[PDB]
Design a protein around this ligand. Sequence first.
Ligand SMILES: *[C@@H]1O[C@H](CO)[C@@H](O[C@@H]2O[C@H](CO)[C@@H](O[C@@H]3O[C@H](CO[C@@H]4O[C@H](CO)[C@@H](O)[C@H](O)[C@@H]4O)[C@@H](O)[C@H](O[C@@H]4O[C@H](CO)[C@@H](O)[C@H](O)[C@@H]4O)[C@@H]3O)[C@H](O)[C@H]2NC(C)=O)[C@H](O)[C@H]1NC(C)=O
Ligand SMILES: CCCCS(=O)(=O)N[C@@H](Cc1ccc(OCCCCC2CCNCC2)cc1)C(=O)O
Ligand SMILES: *[C@@H]1O[C@H](CO)[C@@H](O[C@@H]2O[C@H](CO)[C@@H](O)[C@H](O)[C@H]2NC(C)=O)[C@H](O)[C@H]1NC(C)=O
Ligand SMILES: *[C@@H]1O[C@H](CO)[C@@H](O)[C@H](O)[C@H]1NC(C)=O
Ligand SMILES: *[C@@H]1O[C@H](CO)[C@@H](O)[C@H](O)[C@H]1NC(C)=O
Ligand SMILES: [Ca+2]
Ligand SMILES: [Ca+2]
Ligand SMILES: [Ca+2]
Ligand SMILES: [Ca+2]
Ligand SMILES: [Ca+2]
Ligand SMILES: [Ca+2]
Ligand SMILES: [Mg+2]
Lengths: 216, 453, 214, 466
Amino acid sequence: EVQLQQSGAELVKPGASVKLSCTASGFNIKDTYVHWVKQRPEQGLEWIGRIDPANGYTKYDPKFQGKATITADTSSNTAYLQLSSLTSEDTAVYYCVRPLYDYYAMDYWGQGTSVTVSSAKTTAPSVYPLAPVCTGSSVTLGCLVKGYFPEPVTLTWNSGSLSSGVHTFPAVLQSDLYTLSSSVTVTSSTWPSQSITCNVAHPASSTKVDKKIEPR
Amino acid sequence: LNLDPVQLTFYAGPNGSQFGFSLDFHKDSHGRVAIVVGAPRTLGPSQEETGGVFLCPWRAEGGQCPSLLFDLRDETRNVGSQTLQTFKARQGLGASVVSWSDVIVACAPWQHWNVLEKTEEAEKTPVGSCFLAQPESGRRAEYSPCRGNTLSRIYVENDFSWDKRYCEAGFSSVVTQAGELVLGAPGGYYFLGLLAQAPVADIFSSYRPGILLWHVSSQSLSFDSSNPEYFDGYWGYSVAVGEFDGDLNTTEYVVGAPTWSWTLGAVEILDSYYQRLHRLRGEQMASYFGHSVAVTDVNGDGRHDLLVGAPLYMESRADRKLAEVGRVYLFLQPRGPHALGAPSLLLTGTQLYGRFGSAIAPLGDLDRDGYNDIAVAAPYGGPSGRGQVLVFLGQSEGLRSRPSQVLDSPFPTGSAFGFSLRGAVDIDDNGYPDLIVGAYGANQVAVYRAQPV
Amino acid sequence: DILMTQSPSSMSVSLGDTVSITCHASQGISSNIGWLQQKPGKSFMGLIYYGTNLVDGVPSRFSGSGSGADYSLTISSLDSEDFADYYCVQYAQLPYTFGGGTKLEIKRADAAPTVSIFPPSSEQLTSGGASVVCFLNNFYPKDINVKWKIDGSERQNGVLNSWTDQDSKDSTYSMSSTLTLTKDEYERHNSYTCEATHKTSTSPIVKSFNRNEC
Amino acid sequence: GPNICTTRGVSSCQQCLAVSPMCAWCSDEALPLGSPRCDLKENLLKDNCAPESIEFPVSEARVLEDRPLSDKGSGDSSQVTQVSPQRIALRLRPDDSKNFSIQVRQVEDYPVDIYYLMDLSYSMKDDLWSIQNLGTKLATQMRKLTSNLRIGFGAFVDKPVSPYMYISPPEALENPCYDMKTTCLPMFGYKHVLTLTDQVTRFNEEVKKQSVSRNRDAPEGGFDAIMQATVCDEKIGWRNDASHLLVFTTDAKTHIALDGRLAGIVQPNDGQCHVGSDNHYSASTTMDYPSLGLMTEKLSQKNINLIFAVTENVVNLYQNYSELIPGTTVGVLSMDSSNVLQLIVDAYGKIRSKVELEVRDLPEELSLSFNATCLNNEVIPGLKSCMGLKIGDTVSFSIEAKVRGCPQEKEKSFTIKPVGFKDSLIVQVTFDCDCACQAQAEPNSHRCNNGNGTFECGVCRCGPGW
Ligand SMILES: *[C@@H]1O[C@H](CO)[C@@H](O[C@@H]2O[C@H](CO)[C@@H](O[C@@H]3O[C@H](CO[C@@H]4O[C@H](CO)[C@@H](O)[C@H](O)[C@@H]4O)[C@@H](O)[C@H](O[C@@H]4O[C@H](CO)[C@@H](O)[C@H](O)[C@@H]4O)[C@@H]3O)[C@H](O)[C@H]2NC(C)=O)[C@H](O)[C@H]1NC(C)=O
Ligand SMILES: CCCCS(=O)(=O)N[C@@H](Cc1ccc(OCCCCC2CCNCC2)cc1)C(=O)O
Ligand SMILES: *[C@@H]1O[C@H](CO)[C@@H](O[C@@H]2O[C@H](CO)[C@@H](O)[C@H](O)[C@H]2NC(C)=O)[C@H](O)[C@H]1NC(C)=O
Ligand SMILES: *[C@@H]1O[C@H](CO)[C@@H](O)[C@H](O)[C@H]1NC(C)=O
Ligand SMILES: *[C@@H]1O[C@H](CO)[C@@H](O)[C@H](O)[C@H]1NC(C)=O
Ligand SMILES: [Ca+2]
Ligand SMILES: [Ca+2]
Ligand SMILES: [Ca+2]
Ligand SMILES: [Ca+2]
Ligand SMILES: [Ca+2]
Ligand SMILES: [Ca+2]
Ligand SMILES: [Mg+2]
């Protein structure tokens, strides 16, 4: 079976360089073209370039001419994408692609390598309890996880107990530091009648803080 | 010995089509034997020679045959900022035909190909191409392993390595019992010659019309070389398969290279990874040793034997004079893991310029004595030079040195009667294997039915 | 370069429906187009190559069509797995270019959002910051606007929003909005409001509080 | 005493002569009953046999034409004699043999034809420059050996068809050197340029206007050119009475018969001329390269001495071909043909350094033996070919013909000719097996059993039907 197994997520500083890898599995990397595609939420999908691992001849979009350098080693059955002079805009997901039959197609895709460019140091999150203001039948609590780096974080309630009726929102980059929040909704007879705790683990800095929600 | 030379069967194609240049038996899903006939100069749509294929149902009377239709239209694809082009004019569709299971493979070794990129080009060259058909279902597929999209300048900058532009794929052809098509490409790698193999099932399942350049990942191609011994050797002029290494799970290839080593000629036996197991060197330069190769066990020991034709061999005669008559070499496979020795038998033609050995067809066991037999063609032999086919019977020590039967051409001068042969198949279901003989010069095929001894 | 205008940006449909995604090129590409599928939070899968040819392993309910510079990807009888992103890519010319994308989302009855506002915690206030959080949970359709009003006057600087993918259980969307001020600036004002504008109501859903007062 | 002639107990005069060449027959009437009439000629005269009635043929060999060997091949409209005698009469009786001689001379100042057949593919671009004064300088050197020199020029590349020919872009057809920075001629198979002429400056000026072409594969189609230069007598201009030198220069391998199938060409070479008024080989793209055997047949038919003047990288190749085409000479051509002049002069001397006898139309019942005399009156038995000869040298061969029994036909003629020579010795053989007394027989003789027999040569033979 054809499988393209890329490298792990990269976390680098601006101005540095990084070399992503794409290893062929179940076939010879020399068989077909190997492409590289950049993906961003706003800008979308962008074609970087291609290489013929058999001979090393490459093609590039003139946009990436200079930053992107595609190479390949038939020995290790691997293709490479090197990005130089990194910038915040280089923060994207990168995919290696090969065709199935048509020489020029784009059919098989690697799982994708995450790349995040930032100067931020390994910063621990600041967990803040979110209690409502001084009435209905349903009550909603919350928890704020502000100013941590890098991703990710795990957020549960009462150590995985309270799971249903929870909305943990995606992290958002705020000045080189991430911010995340999560809400939970139960009945009025449950809170403050029952203790609800926000469990936040940040394995990067190896911290597991837990804040109990207290009324006002 | 027991082929009927009185009541023949004649099939015929259009005039000037070279009907009968190649032929083969073809069984349908129900086991009904037909005759696929290549006609490499059949007129196409633009009143231009493109070749053609005919599927002849078996009839004692013979006659005309329906066409096996293939796309004869030139193709153009604009993709990847390039222009792909196929050229089927004078491509020679039907210069070789071969049948395996319910599938027919007909090749156009001189189909031309080119790639345009702005002002540059790959060069318009005969990469060759093969056409596959499942007649009962209508399924069609193509296979052209030497098509590339590399521009001419790159080949120059890389000293013409891995240059498959002049392959002429399908020049010769054969299919393993497992269903693997093996193409001879005598012009591959700047006229060294290469082999292209791919499972028939994967050819069909990976082909789509209009792609022109697609991958058949399960395919396997032989290798380029820097050894001048192989330069202009036309490796793959003829091809055959058989069992020569004692391992029944592997299929061995037999490749004819009739101009190998400065036209000395050679035949090589290799494994499915194109690793060389044996090499038989030609006996005489320019004799075209390896023009034809045949694989069959003739001495009934279960071990496949090798036959090599050198149709231009010049026999020595009185007063230090040579006479081109052609020669056939028989190599019996030794017991166990050992090398093929000197030839076990030499068969030499007698008619000057007769080209004895131009074609060698295993007949199966014709006279039903327990030993497989062969037919050798001398397409310009016989006392009239009209052509002859000679039958040699197998025996415990190999082959008989004298023919058991000679078939004189029923066609006029120039028919090249015998240029293509095929035996070992019972077409009328009488229990005896029969022989079909092509005569492209007369655009006809003759069928010789074997009868009780 | 060849621009690939893919439409629509999104569509709300249900299981069994027959939908069609279109892709328009700035010039003729002669069927040199492929169609891609990206399931949520996962990588890509090839659907179609060269206009109409299915990739190995793709169900026949998918089909590609079109010619010249106008092409279409049709999904007959939608399956629960088919709800994902789809992209067209042309390879008629270098550089290869992609379409904007198309997201197939589950259709359901409209639903008003549950709004909840949250004043800054004590901990954050003692550190020198102040963030007001506004949760807008379980609504449909996705199209929604949040407006922050400090003392009744709109505020746009310092706002940080985040949305969830369509929920697996009820097929509803949820939003989170966080206004971050300094502790000093937070005390210059008293009233803090987040207004939610959704098609389920001509009047915006308002939730607010007053500093000090509780 | 009794010998094999009497003890055999013969019945007729014919049977008597068939016993042994020493036997004789007496047709005299007055001969004793007990005395045999088939004995040695000495015994018959001893028995008072009339000398006129004695049948005893003697195997002889008398010359009919015996022109002297010429000292010069120059002058005359080819009244040159290089084989003497030119014709003899041979008379043989059953199981008898007779000897005779023949002289062969490599005549001095013999006319010479030299047709320069040149590879003009791109690999030979620099060779053209070297030979721009060859015709002049070759005339200067051959003037010492012959006063009748004619030279001509032909050129070849390969079959102008894919894949040998570059067929794209369209410009490449008009100028194969298009993708380079130069111009060369469109591809051509073989073109005749200059018919054999004594006007050697025509060679120089024709060569100065020649240029090269270019094709894709290294082996070239020179064998096509060799065939056409051989079988197109009138166009090339070979002379009847002249040494024919076909000088073939190339730096590459050569295409051979059955190579043409890579261009879709399967038709065998027909060995016929196909060079029309336009002087190009018109069957180049429709007919396969010729085979070594076919080339040999035509070279021998037209008395053409083929010279392989090839470069060191392919000398071995062409030396091996030369052994498959007897009479062919090989010389080592430098990488620019700068040495081709001396190469041709040495080839000419090597070509005329041999005399090899050849027998044509020899009857089955006749067998021959040869004693050669080469160098200095040195007899070499069982040999019919001399080597190491120089222009002007003369050799001789002693020949003995042995007839087995008596053939049905009493008069046959065969030819002894040296290889490549014009003149030859014609041997008119007459088999003297019958007796003269048989021509005057008596059918249904009164002397032989009441007309049941025939009386010939003094005896009674059973007539026809008994
Ligand atoms: C032109 O024609 C000549 C004459 O035939 C060719 O030269 C021949 O080339 C053959 C292949 O290269 C040579 O065969 C070899 O013979 C070797 C030793 O025997 C020779 O002894 C003679 C004495 O008469 C000497 O001249 C030689 O130099 C040698 O010493 C073998 O050892 C040799 O090795 C074998 O190789 C074969 C594969 O060919 C294997 O099967 C075997 O296991 C072993 O490895 C081989 O048999 C032959 O000697 C040689 N003849 C001469 C006189 O040199 C040219 O190749 C031809 N050239 C062209 C361009 O056509
Ligand atoms: C270099 C290509 C063309 C050379 S040319 O234009 O000078 N033509 C010559 C004939 C010729 C053709 C090819 C050649 O090299 C062949 C190169 C082989 C290299 C390959 C061999 C297989 N392995 C890979 C490398 C040499 C001469 C003329 O006289 O018109
Ligand atoms: C060639 O020479 C041989 C000798 O080498 C001749 O044979 C001898 O002939 C004489 C005739 O006087 C005999 O006495 C010898 O016995 C012969 N020797 C043999 C036969 O070995 C032969 O006659 C000569 N032939 C020709 C044609 O010249
Ligand atoms: C070509 O074909 C016709 C049949 O239409 C046949 O009769 C004829 O002999 C052939 N030869 C030529 C030269 O036409
Ligand atoms: C035959 O040989 C003898 C010598 O044995 C010689 O005298 C005679 O001249 C020869 N015959 C001819 C015709 O030359
Ligand atoms: Ca095997
Ligand atoms: Ca055997
Ligand atoms: Ca048998
Ligand atoms: Ca039968
Ligand atoms: Ca050539
Ligand atoms: Ca030169
Ligand atoms: Mg050349």
